[PDB]
Structure 1
Amino acid sequence: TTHVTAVGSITLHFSTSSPQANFIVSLCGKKSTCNAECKPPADHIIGEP
Structure 2
Amino acid sequence: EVEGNSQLQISFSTALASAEFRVQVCSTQVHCAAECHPPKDHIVNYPAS
Give the TM-score, by structure 2 length. 0.78
Give the share of equivalent positions with the same residue, in percent.
Answer: 38
Q: Residue 44 in 1 paired to residue 42 in 2?
A: yes
> Which is strand-richer, 1 or 2?
2
* Alignment-derived partner of residue 21 in structure 1: 19
Paired with 1:28 and 1:46, the residues of 2 have a C-alpha distance of 33
Structure 1 stretches of at least 4 aligned residues deviating more than 4 Å after TM superposition: none
Q: Secondary structure at the match of 1:11?
A: coil
Instruction: Quote the RMSD (CA, aligned, Å).
Output: 1.2
Query: Which consecutive unaligned segments of at least 5 residues does structure 1 have?
Result: none
Query: Which consecutive unaligned segments of at least 5 residues does structure 2 have?
Result: none
